[PDB]
Coordinates of C-alpha atoms and ligand atoms in Angstrom, one line a residue:
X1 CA 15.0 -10.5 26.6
X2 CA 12.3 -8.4 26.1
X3 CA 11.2 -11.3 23.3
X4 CA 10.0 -13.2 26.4
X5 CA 7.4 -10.5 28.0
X6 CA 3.8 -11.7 28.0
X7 CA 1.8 -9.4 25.4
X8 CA -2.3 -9.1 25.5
X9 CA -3.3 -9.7 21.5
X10 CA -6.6 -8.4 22.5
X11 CA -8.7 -11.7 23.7
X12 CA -5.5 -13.9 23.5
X13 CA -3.0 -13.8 26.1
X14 CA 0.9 -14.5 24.7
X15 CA 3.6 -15.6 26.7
X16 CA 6.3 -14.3 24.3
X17 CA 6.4 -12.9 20.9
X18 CA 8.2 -15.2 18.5
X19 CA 5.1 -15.6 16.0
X20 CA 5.2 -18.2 13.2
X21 CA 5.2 -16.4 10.0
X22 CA 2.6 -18.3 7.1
X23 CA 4.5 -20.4 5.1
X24 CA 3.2 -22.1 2.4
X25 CA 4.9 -25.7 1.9
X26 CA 2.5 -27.7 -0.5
X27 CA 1.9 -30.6 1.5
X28 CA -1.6 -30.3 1.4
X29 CA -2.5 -32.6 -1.1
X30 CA -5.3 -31.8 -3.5
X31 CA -5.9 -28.9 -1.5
X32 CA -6.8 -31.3 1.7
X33 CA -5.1 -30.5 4.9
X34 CA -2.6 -33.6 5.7
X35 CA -1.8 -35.3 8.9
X36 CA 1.6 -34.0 7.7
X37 CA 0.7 -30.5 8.4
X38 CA -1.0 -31.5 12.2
X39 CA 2.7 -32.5 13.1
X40 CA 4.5 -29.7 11.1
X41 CA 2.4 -27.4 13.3
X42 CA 2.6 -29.1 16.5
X43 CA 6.3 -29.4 16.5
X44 CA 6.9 -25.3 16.6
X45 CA 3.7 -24.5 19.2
X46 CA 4.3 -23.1 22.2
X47 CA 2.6 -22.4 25.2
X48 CA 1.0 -19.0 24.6
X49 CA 2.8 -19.4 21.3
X50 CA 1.0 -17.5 18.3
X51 CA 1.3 -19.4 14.7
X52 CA -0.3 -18.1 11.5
X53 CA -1.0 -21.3 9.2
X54 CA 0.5 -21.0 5.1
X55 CA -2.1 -19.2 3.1
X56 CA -5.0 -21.3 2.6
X57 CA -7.8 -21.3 -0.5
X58 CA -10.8 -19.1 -0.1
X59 CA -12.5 -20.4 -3.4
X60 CA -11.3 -23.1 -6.3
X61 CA -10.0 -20.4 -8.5
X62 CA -7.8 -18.8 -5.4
X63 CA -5.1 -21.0 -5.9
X64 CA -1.5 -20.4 -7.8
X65 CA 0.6 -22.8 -5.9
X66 CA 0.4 -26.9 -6.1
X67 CA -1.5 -28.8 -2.9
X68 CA -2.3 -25.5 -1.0
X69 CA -4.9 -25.9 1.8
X70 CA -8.6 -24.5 1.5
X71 CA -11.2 -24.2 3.8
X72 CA -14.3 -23.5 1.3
X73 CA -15.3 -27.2 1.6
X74 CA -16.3 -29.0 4.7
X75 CA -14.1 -31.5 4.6
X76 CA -11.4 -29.4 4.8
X77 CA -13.1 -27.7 7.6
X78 CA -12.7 -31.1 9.1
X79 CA -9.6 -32.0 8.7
X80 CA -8.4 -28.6 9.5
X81 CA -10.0 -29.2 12.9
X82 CA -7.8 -31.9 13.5
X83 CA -4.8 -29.7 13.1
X84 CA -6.4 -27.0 15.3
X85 CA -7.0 -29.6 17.9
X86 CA -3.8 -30.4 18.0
X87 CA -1.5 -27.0 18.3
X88 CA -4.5 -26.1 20.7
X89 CA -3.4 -28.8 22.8
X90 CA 0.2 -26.9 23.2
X91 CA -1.6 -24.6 24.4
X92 CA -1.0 -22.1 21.1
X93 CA -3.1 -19.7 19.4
X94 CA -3.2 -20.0 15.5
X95 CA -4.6 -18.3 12.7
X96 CA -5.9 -19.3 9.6
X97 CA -4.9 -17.0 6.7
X98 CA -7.1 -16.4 3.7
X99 CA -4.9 -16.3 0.3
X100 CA -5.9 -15.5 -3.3
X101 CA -3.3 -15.6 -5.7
X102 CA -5.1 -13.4 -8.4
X103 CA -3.4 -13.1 -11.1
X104 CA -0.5 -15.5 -10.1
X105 CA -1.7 -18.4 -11.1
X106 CA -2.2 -20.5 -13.8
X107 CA -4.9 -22.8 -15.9
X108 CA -3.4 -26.0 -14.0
X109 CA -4.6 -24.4 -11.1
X110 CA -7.9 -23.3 -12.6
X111 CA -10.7 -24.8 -13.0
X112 CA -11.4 -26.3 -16.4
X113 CA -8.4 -24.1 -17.3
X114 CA -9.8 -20.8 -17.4
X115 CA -7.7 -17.3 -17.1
X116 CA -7.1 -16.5 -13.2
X117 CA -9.0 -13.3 -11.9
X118 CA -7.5 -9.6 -11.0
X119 CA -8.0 -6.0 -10.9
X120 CA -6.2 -6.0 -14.6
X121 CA -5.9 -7.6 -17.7
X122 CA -1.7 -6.8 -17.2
X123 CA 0.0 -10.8 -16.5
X124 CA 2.9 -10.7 -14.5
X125 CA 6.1 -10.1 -16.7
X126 CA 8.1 -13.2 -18.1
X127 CA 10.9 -12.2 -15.6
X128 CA 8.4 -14.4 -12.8
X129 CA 7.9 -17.8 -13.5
X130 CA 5.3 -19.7 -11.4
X131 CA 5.9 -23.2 -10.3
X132 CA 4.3 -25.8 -11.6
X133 CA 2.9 -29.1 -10.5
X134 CA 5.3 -31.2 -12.1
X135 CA 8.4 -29.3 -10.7
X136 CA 9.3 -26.8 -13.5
X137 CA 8.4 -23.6 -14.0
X138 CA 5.4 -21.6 -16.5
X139 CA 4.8 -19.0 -17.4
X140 CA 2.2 -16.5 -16.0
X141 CA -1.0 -15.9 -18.2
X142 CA -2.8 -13.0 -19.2
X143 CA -5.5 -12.6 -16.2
X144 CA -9.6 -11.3 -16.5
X145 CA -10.4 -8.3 -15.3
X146 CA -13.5 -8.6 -13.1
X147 CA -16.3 -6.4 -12.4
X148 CA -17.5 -5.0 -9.5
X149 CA -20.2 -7.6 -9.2
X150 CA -17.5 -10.7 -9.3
X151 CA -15.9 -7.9 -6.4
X152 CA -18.7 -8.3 -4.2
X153 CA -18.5 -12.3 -5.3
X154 CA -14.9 -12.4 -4.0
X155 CA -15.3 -10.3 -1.0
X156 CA -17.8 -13.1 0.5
X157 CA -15.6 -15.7 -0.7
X158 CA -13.7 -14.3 2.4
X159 CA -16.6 -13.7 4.5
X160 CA -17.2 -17.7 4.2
X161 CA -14.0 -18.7 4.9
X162 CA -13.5 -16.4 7.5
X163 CA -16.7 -18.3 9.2
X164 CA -15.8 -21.8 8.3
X165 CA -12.0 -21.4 10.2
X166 CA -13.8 -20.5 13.1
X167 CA -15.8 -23.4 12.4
X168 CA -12.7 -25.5 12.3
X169 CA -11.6 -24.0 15.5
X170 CA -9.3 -21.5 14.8
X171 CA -8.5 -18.3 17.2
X172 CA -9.0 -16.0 14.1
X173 CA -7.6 -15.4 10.5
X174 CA -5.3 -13.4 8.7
X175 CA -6.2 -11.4 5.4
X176 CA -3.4 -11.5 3.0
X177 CA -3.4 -8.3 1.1
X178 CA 0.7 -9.1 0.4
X179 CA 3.2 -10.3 -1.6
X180 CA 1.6 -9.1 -5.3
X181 CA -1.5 -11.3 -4.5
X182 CA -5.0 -10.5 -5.8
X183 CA -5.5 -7.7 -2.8
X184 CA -2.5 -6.1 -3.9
X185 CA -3.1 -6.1 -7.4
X186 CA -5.9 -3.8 -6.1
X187 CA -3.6 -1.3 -3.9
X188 CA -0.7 -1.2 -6.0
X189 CA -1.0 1.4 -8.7
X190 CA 1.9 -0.1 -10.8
X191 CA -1.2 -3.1 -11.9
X192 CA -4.5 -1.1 -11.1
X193 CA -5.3 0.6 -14.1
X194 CA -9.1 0.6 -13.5
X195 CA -11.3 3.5 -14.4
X196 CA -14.0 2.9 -11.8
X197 CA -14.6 2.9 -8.8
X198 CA -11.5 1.0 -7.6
X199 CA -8.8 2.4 -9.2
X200 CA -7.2 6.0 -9.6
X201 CA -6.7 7.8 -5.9
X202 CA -5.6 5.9 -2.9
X203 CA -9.1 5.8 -1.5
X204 CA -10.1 3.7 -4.4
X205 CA -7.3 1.7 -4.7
X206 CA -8.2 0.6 -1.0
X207 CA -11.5 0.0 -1.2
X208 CA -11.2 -4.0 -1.9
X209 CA -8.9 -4.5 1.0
X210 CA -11.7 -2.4 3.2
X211 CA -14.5 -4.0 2.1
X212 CA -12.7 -7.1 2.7
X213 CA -12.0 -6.8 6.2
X214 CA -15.3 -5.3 7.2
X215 CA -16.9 -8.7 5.7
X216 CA -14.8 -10.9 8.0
X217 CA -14.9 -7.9 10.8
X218 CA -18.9 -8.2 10.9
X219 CA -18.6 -12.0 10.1
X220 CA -16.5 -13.4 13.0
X221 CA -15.3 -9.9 15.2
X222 CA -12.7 -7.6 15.1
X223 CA -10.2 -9.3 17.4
X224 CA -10.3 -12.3 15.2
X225 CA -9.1 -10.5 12.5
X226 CA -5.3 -9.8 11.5
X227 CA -4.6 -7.8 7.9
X228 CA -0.8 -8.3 6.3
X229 CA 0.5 -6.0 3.6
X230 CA 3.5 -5.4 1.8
X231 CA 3.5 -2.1 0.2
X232 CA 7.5 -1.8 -0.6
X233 CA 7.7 -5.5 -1.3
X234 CA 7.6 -5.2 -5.7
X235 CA 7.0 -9.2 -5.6
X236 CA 5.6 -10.5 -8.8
X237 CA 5.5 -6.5 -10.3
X238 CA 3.8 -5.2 -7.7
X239 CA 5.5 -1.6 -7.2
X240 CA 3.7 1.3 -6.2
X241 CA 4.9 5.0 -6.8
X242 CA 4.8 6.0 -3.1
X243 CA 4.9 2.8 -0.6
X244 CA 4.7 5.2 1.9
X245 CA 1.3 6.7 0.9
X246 CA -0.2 3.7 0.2
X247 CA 0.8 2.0 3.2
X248 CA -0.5 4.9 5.2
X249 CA -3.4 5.0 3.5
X250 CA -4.2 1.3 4.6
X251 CA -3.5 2.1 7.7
X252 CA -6.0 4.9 7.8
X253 CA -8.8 2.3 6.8
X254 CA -8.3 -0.1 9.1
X255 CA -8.0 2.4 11.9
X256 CA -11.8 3.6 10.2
X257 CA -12.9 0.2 10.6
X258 CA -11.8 -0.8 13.9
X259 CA -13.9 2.7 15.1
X260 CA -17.3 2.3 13.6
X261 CA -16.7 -1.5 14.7
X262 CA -16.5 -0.6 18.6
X263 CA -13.3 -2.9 18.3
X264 CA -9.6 -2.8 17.5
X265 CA -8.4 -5.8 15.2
X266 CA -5.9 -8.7 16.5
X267 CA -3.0 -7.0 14.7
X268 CA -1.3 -5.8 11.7
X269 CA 1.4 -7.8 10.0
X270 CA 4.2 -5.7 7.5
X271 CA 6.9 -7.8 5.7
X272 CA 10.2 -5.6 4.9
X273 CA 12.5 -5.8 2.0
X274 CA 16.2 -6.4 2.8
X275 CA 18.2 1.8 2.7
X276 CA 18.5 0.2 6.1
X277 CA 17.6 3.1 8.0
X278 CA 15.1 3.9 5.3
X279 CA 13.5 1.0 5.4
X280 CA 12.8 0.7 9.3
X281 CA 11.7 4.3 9.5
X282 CA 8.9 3.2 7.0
X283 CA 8.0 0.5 9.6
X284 CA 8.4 3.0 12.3
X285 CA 5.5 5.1 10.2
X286 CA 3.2 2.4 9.8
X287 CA 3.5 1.5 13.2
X288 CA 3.5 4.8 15.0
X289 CA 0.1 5.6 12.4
X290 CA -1.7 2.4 13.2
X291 CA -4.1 2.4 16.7
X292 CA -3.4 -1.4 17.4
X293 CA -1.1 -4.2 17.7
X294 CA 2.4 -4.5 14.6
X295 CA 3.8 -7.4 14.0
X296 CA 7.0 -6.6 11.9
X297 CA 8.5 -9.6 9.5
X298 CA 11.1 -9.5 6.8
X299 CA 14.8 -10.6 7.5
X300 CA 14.4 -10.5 11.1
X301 CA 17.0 -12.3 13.7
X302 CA 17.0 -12.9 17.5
X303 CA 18.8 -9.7 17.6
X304 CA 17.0 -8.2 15.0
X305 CA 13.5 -9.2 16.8
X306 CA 15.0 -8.3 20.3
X307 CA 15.8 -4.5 19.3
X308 CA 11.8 -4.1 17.6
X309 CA 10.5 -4.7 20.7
X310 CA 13.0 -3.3 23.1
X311 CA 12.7 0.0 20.4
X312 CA 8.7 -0.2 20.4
X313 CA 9.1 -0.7 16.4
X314 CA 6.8 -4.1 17.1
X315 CA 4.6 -5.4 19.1
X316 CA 5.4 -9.2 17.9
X317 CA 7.9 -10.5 15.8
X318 CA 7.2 -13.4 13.2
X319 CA 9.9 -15.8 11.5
X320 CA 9.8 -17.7 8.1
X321 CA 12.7 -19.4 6.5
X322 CA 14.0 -20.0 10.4
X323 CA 11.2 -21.5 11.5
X324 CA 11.2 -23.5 8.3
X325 CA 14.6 -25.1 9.9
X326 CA 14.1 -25.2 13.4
X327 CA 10.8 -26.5 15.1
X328 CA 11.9 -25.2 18.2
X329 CA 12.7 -21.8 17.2
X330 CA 11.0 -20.2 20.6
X331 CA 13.3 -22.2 22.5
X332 CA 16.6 -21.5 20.3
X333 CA 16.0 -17.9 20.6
X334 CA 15.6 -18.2 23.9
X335 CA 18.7 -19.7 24.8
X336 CA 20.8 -18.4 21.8
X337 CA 21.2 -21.7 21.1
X338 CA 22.4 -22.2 17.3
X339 CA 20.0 -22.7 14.6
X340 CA 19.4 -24.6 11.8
X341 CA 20.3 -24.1 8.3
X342 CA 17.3 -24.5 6.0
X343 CA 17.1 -26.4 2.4
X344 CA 15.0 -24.1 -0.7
X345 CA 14.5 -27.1 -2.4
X346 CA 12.6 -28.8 -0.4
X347 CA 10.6 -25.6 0.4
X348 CA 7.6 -26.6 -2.1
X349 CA 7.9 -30.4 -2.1
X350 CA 5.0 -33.0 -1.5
X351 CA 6.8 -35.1 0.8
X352 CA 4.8 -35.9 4.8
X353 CA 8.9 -35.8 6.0
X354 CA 11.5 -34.6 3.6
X355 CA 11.9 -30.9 4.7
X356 CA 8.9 -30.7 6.4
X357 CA 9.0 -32.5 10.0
X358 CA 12.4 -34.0 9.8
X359 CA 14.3 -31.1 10.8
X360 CA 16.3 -31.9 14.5
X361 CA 15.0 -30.3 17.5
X362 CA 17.9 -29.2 20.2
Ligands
WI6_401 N1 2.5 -16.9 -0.7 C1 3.3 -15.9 -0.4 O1 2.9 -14.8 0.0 C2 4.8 -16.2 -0.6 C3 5.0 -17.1 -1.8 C4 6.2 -17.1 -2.3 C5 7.4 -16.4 -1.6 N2 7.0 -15.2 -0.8 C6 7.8 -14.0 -0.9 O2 8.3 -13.8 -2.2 C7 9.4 -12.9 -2.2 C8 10.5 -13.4 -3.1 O3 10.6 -14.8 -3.1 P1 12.0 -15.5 -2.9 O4 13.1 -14.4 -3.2 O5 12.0 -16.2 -1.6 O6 11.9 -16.6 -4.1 P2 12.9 -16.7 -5.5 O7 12.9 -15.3 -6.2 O8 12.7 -17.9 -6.2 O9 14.3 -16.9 -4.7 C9 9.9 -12.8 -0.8 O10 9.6 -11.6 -0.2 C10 9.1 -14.0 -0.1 O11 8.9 -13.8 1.3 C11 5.6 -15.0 -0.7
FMN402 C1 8.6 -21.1 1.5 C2 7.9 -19.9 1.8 C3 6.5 -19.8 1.8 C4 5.9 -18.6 2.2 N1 4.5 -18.6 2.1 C5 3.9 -17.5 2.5 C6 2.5 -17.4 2.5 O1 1.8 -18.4 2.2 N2 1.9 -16.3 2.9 C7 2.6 -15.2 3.2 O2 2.0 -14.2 3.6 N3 3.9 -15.2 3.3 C8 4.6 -16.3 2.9 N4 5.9 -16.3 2.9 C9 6.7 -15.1 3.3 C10 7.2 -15.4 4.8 O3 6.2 -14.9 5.7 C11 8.5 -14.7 5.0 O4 9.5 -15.7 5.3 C12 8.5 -13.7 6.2 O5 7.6 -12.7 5.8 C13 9.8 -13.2 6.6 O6 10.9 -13.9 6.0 P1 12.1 -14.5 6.9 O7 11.6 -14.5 8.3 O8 12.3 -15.9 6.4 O9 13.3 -13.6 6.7 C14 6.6 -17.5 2.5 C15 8.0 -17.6 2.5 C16 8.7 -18.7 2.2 C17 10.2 -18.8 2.3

C-alpha cells in the first residue's frame, strides 16, 4: 500500500499519506474554538498524521458560515493552542487554514450588518442559498467592490493570521483560494469584472492570490505555507472560461514565489469535481507543472487514493465526508476495514457530540 510510505513534506516528516481534508462543522461557538473541536481533532490524529483544521476567520467580516473558528483575536489564539497541544501529542502535524468567504456571506454574519467584501459588485445567483444561523436558508446579498487599498488591507489580514497560528502552535497554514471564496472571486473570470489592475489577463486575475502568499511566505516561511484552489470546481458561480489556463497560471506563480523565496512551499492542495479521464489529466497538468509537493482531493477512495500515489498523480491524498464518519480513517484504510456512513444533516450543527465526536471507532 503505497498509502503507507513515509513522505518528507519539506520540514515535516509523514508516516503515511491519508491527510485530513478542512472541514468546516460550526461547532466553534461565536467564532471561539470549543473543547469540542480539541476531541474532534484528536480522535483522527495519527502518528506522523497530517490534518488541515476547517477554514478558520482571518478578520470579523471573513465569515459566511455560523460559529466558524478565527484566529484574529488572542483568545482564540489561546484556545486554539489547546487544540494544537493536543493533536501534537499524537504526534500529528496540522495546519491552520485561513478562509474568507467574500462575497458568500451575509449581514448576520457582518458586522453591524454591512454588505460582505469581493472583487465585484455581482451576488451569487439565487440558485445558492447560504445557511443561516437559525437553520434555514437566505439569500446571498449584493457584495462591495473594494479598492486596491482595502486589497492591501485584506492581504495582511492574512499576514496576521498566518503569524498568530504559529503563535498558537501550529506546523503551518493553508491559504484557501477554493471553493468560489473571496480568492476565487479574484481568479475566476466568470465574477472578476475589474478594470484595474486585478482584473482582465490571467496575470491580473492572480495577483491577489500572489500577493497573498508572499505576505504569509515572508511572514512565517515557505515550508509553512500550503495554497488550495479549485479552478474547475463552479461552486457558488465561480466558473472560469479555461480552468486549465487559470490553474496553470497559479501554478506558475507559486513556482515564482517559491524561487525568489530560496524555498519550496509545504504543498499544493486541488479539489476535483466528480469527463473522468478529462478530469484526472487536468490534475495530472497541475501536478506535472508545479515544482513541489500535490495533494489531490475530491471524491477520492482507498482505491482511488492508492492509484494517485502508486501513478505519481499525488503526493498526499486528503479525505472529507469520510473522515467526517470515521475517526479512524488511517487505520480503516489501512486494513480495508469498512467505513462509516456519514449523516449531511448534522454536517453544520452546534452540537459538542451529535455528529461530531460520536461517530464509532473500529
Ligand atoms: N468552506 C468550504 O470551502 C466548503 C463549504 C461548503 C461545501 N464545500 C464544497 O461545496 C461544494 C458543493 O457543496 P455540496 O454539494 O456538498 O452541498 P449541497 O449543494 O448543499 O449538497 C463541494 O465541492 C464541497 O466540497 C466547500
Ligand atoms: C461539511 C463540509 C465542510 C467543508 N469545509 C471545507 C472548508 O472549510 N474548507 C475547504 O477548503 N473545503 C471544505 N470542504 C470540502 C472538503 O475539503 C471536501 O470534502 C474534500 O475536498 C473532498 O471531498 P470528499 O473527500 O468528501 O469526497 C468541506 C466539505 C464538507 C462536506
Amino acid at each position: 500500500n503505497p498509502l503507507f510510505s513515509p513522505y518528507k513534506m519539506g520540514k515535516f516528516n509523514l508516516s503515511h499519506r491519508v491527510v485530513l481534508a478542512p472541514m468546516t462543522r460550526c461547532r466553534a461557538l461565536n467564532n471561539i474554538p470549543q473543547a469540542a473541536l480539541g476531541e474532534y481533532y484528536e480522535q483522527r490524529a495519527t502518528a506522523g498524521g497530517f490534518l488541515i483544521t476547517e477554514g478558520t476567520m482571518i478578520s470579523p467580516t471573513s465569515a459566511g458560515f455560523p460559529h466558524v473558528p478565527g484566529i484574529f483575536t488572542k483568545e482564540q489564539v489561546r484556545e486554539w493552542k489547546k487544540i494544537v497541544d493536543v493533536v501534537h501529542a499524537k504526534g500529528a502535524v496540522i495546519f491552520c487554514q485561513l478562509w474568507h468567504v467574500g462575497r458568500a456571506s451575509h449581514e448576520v454574519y457582518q458586522p453591524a450588518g454591512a454588505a460582505p467584501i469581493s472583487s465585484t459588485e455581482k451576488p451569487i445567483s439565487n440558485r445558492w442559498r447560504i445557511l443561516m444561523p437559525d437553520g434555514t436558508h437566505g439569500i446571498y446579498p449584493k457584495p462591495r467592490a473594494i479598492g486596491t487599498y482595502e486589497i492591501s488591507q485584506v492581504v495582511e489580514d492574512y499576514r496576521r493570521s498566518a503569524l498568530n497560528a504559529i503563535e498558537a502552535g501550529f506546523d503551518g497554514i493553508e491559504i484557501h483560494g477554493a471553493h468560489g471564496y473571496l480568492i476565487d472571486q479574484f481568479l475566476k473570470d466568470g465574477i472578476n469584472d475589474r478594470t484595474d489592475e486585478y482584473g482582465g489577463s490571467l496575470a491580473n486575475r492572480c495577483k491577489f492570490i500572489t500577493q497573498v502568499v508572499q505576505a504569509v511566505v515572508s511572514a512565517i516561511g515557505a515550508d509553512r505555507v500550503g495554497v488550495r484552489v479549485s479552478p474547475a470546481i463552479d461552486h457558488l458561480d465561480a466558473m472560469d472560461s479555461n480552468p486549465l489556463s487559470l490553474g496553470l497560471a497559479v501554478v506558475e506563480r507559486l513556482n515564482k514565489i517559491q524561487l525568489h523565496s530560496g524555498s519550496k512551499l509545504a504543498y499544493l492542495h486541488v479539489t476535483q469535481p466528480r469527463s473522468e479521464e478529462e478530469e484526472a489529466r487536468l490534475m495530472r497538468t497541475l501536478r506535472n507543472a508545479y515544482q513541489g509537493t500535490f495533494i489531490c482531493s475530491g471524491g477520492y477512495t482507498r482505491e482511488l487514493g492508492i492509484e494517485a500515489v502508486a501513478q505519481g498523480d499525488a503526493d498526499l491524498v486528503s479525505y472529507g465526508r469520510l473522515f467526517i464518519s470515521n475517526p479512524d480513517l488511517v487505520m480503516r484504510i489501512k486494513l480495508n476495514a469498512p467505513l462509516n456512513k456519514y449523516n449531511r444533516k448534522t454536517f453544520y450543527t452546534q452540537d459538542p457530540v451529535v455528529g461530531y465526536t460520536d461517530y464509532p471507532f473500529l
